[PDB]
């Protein structure tokens, strides 16, 4: 695993980790935070469907 | 959504 970072990275509000190659991402309206699909449990499929996505901080 | 696709390698 590399030390260090990309100053311009984007981390996901769930695992906390950087992206990688051929992931799907989806961002949360509210808060703007950006989300594997795999951690929030969301397909591009489901996401199709989603008009504004709020994440689950956001939506409490 | 907002959403997004990261490219392959
Ligand atoms: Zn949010
Ligand atoms: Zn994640």
Redesign the interface.
Known sequence: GPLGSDHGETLCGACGDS?????????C?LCEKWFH?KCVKIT?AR?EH????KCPSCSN | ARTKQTARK
Do not use: L, N, R
């Open positions: 992206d990688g190659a051929d992931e799907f991402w989806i961002c309206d699909g591009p996401a989603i008009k504004q996505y």
